[PDB]
């Protein structure tokens, strides 16, 4: 929310690397240069392919949570949503966008 002025969902993606630099290593990345770790990792996992400067909070925080532990490879991304709909509580139709 430091670069986010309101709560209108999607926010600018331009300064995502600078936003992540301020985060501690356990949640963010290492103290090394982001040019080797963060730059490649930002594209490494799956993201919702929205417009160029529209990326919403509940897909980035969820992505970091899923990257922290029990990381899964490509192809079985739908397995995560299956687990959420089989174990996690009511989605309230809010995970339709988070699925991709």
């Amino acid at each position: 929310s430091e670069y986010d002025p309101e709560a209108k969902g999607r926010i600018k993606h331009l300064d995502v690397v600078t936003l992540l630099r301020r985060i501690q290593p356990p949640l963010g990345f290492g103290k090394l240069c982001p040019h080797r770790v963060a730059c490649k990792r930002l594209v490494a996992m799956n993201m919702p392919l929205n417009s160029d400067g529209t990326v919403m909070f509940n897909a980035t925080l969820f992505a970091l949570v899923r990257t922290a532990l029990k990381i899964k490879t490509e192809g079985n991304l739908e397995q995560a949503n299956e687990e959420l709909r089989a174990v996690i509580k009511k989605i309230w139709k809010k995970t339709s966008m988070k699925l991709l």
Binding site: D4, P5, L61
Partner: protein, 96 residues
């Protein structure tokens, strides 16, 4: 016995307790803003207010006001009572 009764939450077919505690915060979440104002004629004060130097000094005054409030003893001298009475005015004025 209370802990054992609290261990019957068997949702761990694929995820442990930590994934049932940290991922749940993602489902129910909302980002709250900071309410940036406009008309920088007013933002000049806003920038001054929320700052490291401001809070510290303002949080040190409380410490000082508490110390002032924690010295009233029994049968205190008239000059001491007057000094404390006029010193309370200083802190009241600073806080207003």
């Amino acid at each position: 016995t209370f802990q054992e009764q609290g261990e019957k939450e068997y949702k761990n077919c694929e995820l442990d307790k930590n994934q049932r505690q940290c991922v749940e915060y993602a489902l129910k979440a909302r980002p709250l803003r900071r309410y940036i104002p406009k008309n920088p004629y007013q933002y000049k004060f806003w920038y001054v207010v929320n700052s490291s130097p401001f809070e510290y000094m303002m949080f040190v005054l409380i410490m000082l006001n508490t110390l002032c409030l924690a010295m009233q003893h029994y049968e205190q001298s008239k000059m001491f009572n007057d000094a404390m009475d006029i010193l309370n005015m200083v802190f009241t004025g600073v806080f207003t």
